[PDB]
Amino acid sequence: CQPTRFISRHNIEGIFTFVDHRCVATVGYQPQELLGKNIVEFCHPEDQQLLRDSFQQVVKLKGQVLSVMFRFRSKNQEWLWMRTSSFTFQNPYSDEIEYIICTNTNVKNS
Amino acid sequence: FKGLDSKTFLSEHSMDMKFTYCDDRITELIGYHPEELLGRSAYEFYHALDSENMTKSHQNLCTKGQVVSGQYRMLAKHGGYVWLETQGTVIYNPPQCIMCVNYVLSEIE
Ligand SMILES: O=S(=O)(c1ccc(Oc2cc(F)cc(Cl)c2)c(Br)c1CO)C(F)F
Numbered sequence: 001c002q003p004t005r006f007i008s009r010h011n012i013e014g015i016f017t018f019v020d021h022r023c024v025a026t027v028g029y030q031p032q033e034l035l036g037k038n039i040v041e042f043c044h045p046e047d048q049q050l051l052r053d054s055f056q057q058v059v060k061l062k063g064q065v066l067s068v069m070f071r072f073r074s075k076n077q078e079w080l081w082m083r084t085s086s087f088t089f090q091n092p093y094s095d096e097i098e099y100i101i102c103t104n105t106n107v108k109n110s
Numbered sequence: 111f112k113g114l115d116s117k118t119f120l121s122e123h124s125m126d127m128k129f130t131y132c133d134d135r136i137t138e139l140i141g142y143h144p145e146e147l148l149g150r151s152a153y154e155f156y157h158a159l160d161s162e163n164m165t166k167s168h169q170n171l172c173t174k175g176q177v178v179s180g181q182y183r184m185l186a187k188h189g190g191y192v193w194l195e196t197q198g199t200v201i202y203n204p205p206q207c208i209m210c211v212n213y214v215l216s217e218i219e
Pocket residue numbers: 121123127152155156164167168171177178179183184185196197198199208210212
């Protein structure tokens with residue numbers, strides 16, 4: 001039985017710049033409801049600073065994976081536990097700013 | 111008991127909803143220092159149960175140009191929530207920014 005998961009890309013600030021349509025089954029939103037918003041806007045107030053600090057560190061970790069668990073507000077206004085695994089990508093043929101790639105899975109907290 | 115002016119404060123936002131200015135009155139009322147709000151979207155601060163209603167109110171502000179929010183909760187600096195009603199107005203130029211007149215309906219809960 002597959003976990004429910006979807007990919008997103010963010011800028012280093014946390015704003016969704018790409019959202020895989022598997023999000024509709026995972027959290028209920030159409031990709032265009034997430035695009036242009038900061039992931040922290042969907043995050044439980046107790047988890048928002050950890051999520052900001054996580055986006056801040058992933059760029060220091062030399063392209064290695066950083067994981068975070070946090071409560072994400074579904075389209076039904078319910079808090080779902082999400083495990084986001086993130087890493088940076090920067091194309092070495094260029095000097096363009098790195099962006100962050102995330103995989104977002106609904107997980108159990110137990 | 112507080113007088114009307116003391117429960118009211120103005121804020122300004124970019125069209126992406128991020129704070130670009132907030133009156134210092136917010137500090138006594140909700141705990142935030144204005145400069146800590148700057149660059150963060152309004153959406154970071156709505157209670158979950160108000161979120162969808164605010165999104166709809168925002169659409170209305172963008173289609174109509176002015177809207178009154180009706181009653182919502184802002185996350186307070188040290189946790190809990192304060193109830194607010196806001197009058198929002200879009201300032202358009204030659205949209206440029208959104209001006210919010212915010213009235214506190216409750217203490218931190
Ligand atoms: O009334 S609106 O125009 C509106 C209301 C609040 C808004 O921002 C604030 C200002 C605050 F002081 C605190 C909080 Cl939590 C949010 C904003 Br931005 C709008 C415009 O959509 C509509 F969206 F509700």
